[PDB]
Ligand SMILES: Nc1nc2c(ncn2[C@@H]2O[C@H](COP(=O)(O)OP(=O)(O)O)[C@@H](O)[C@H]2O)c(=O)[nH]1
């Protein structure tokens with residue numbers, strides 16, 4: 001293969017990204033995915049497996065893979081780590097008892113091999129609730145300061161009203177564009 | 185071009201497959217027109233992304249109908265393969281159905297296929313790919329099977345065993361469907377439950393096929409090529425700590441196949457490819473510390 | 484969260500003023516009967532044993548865990564259940580109920596109502612013309628022809644259970 005075709009393939013692959021959405025069940029992953037696209041929220045059902053979506057944002061082709069956060073599904077998350085440019089970890093603020101379980105889950109996702117070089121965007125969903133933990137609370141309970149091998153950044157949101165959702169994707173794209181992309 | 189202009193024509197042609205399937209007088213002209221209209225976007229397949237979702241829905245509703253004859257379902261499989269080769273299987277099969285309920289029906293179709301039917305090979309190929317899409321579900325095959333001892337005496341075969349047998353039977357065909365099987369090898373043998381019950385068996389069979397195959401007969405060469413492709417897919421889409429315990433045994437069989445002295449250029453490429461995947465299994469992936477400070481993603 | 488916990492032989496109750504758009508959580512309840520006359524946003528019934536919960540419409544989700552010999556009757560958009568054995572549920576789901584690691588669940592329609600239930604359904608943004616209670620998915624059983632042996636329907640002769 002010549003240099004022209006190699007450059008063409010590199011440019012074609014550069015215009016494609018992968019944003020794997022993970023998190024515990026009943027967190028609001030499907031709701032966020034539907035609000036970011038503009039679909040209806042009153043007709044959403046829990047994923048019995050995993051859903052896929054494709055869209056275009058700022059010229060970049062974003063492919064989102066929303067996996068179920070059920071107990072019997074976590075063991076299969078490894079089947080979605082190949083070619084992952086971003087990891088959207090959703091955390092429910094109202095969920096305060098299972099937090100410890102949500103901290104162990106995000107901590108093990110960071111010691112993986114395929115997910116070594118990939119941005120991290122943590123969405124504190126359900127922020128408009130009375131007993132919704134603040135951003136600092138979720139940052140300290142999950143121990144985000146200890147993270148050093150990945151570029152993380154916490155940011156609350158609320159899919160019920162579509163707030164603080166565009167800034168997260170904008171920051172993810174800015175961080176992805178800050179590093180060099182080389183084929184393999 | 186800039187956008188898709190032949191929208192109504194393509195829609196009418198796709199809605200005409202139900203009246204041009206019996207006689208081939210109006211079946212060949214439709215295929216020729218579809219190919220001529222699709223070849224114009226061979227260099228710009230990205231311009232079809234916003235049309236390849238509704239065309240796949242129309243093509244799937246025809247093959248999913250139980251009252252759709254063999255000749256009608258095979259016509260819908262040729263158009264699907266055409267769209268795949270035009271746009272791309274990696275970007276086309278990703279949008280295909282991937283629910284759980286689509287695990288048993290699709291498989292059943294793969295069971296009612298004649299490998300000695302060259303007039304409908306496009307049906308055997310694309311179908312396999314669709315199966316590989318239904319192995320990205322986060323559940324086990326034992327849960328879908330349920331109770332297998334429902335009939336007296338003759339027990340029911342699980343879905344895992346059926347998929348394994350189908351893959352073992354199609355990695356040794358001459359047609360384009362062997363390649364599809366390699367896709368299923370990277371989607372089936374890499375699963376959590378399938379690997380636990382179909383990794384030692386699949387790796388003992390591959391070693392045996394590599395040990396008793398010659399590069400001087402037509403069949404043996406096909407079997408060796410299929411086995412090498414399956415091993416490469418396993419080592420690529422597989423884990424390093426599940427595949428590392430086997431990389432020394434595989435390396436040995438590969439070296440024993442004395443490929444660097446064969447006059448088969450494709451066997452040598454597969455051997456080299458399998459030699460670099462096995463090698464990368466002996467070392468942990470590292471990350472370029474030199475990024476975020478020497479250039480952006482684009483220019 | 485706003486709810487009771489660590490109680491026994493206690494019949495609790497709330498009004499719409501302390502239930503409106505507020506996440507609710509129950510934990511460690513034995514032989515108790517709760518009555519929430521409002522529209523709680525979310526509901527979480529954990530570690531329940533011989534407890535009868537009669538809650539009004541729930542705008543989002545109802546989660547149940549470690550429940551046994553319970554009698555639930557709440558309407559919502561989704562109902563998640565984990566580790567539950569023998570627990571009747573008068574459910575009115577606008578989307579879908581799911582069950583995991585369950586066995587012996589009995590699903591039946593929803594018939595509970597209070598004088599002010601009309602002004603509380605308007606607060607749930609729910610659709611009264613949607614009830615898929617007779618269509619629950621099982622994560623442990625994903626067959627095509629055979630049914631799920633972990634959940635069934637309650638007979639019409641066992642649905643006239645006392646609400647007192
Ligand atoms: N109050 C509130 N509820 C939400 C929000 N986002 C999602 N939910 C609800 O939480 C429940 C779980 O949502 P779902 O998308 O099924 O999450 P997933 O299936 O875990 O990814 C759904 O009923 C949503 O309507 C939010 O911002 N606020």
Ligand SMILES: [Mg+2]
Nearest residue numbers: 029030046047
């Ligand atoms: Mg979901």
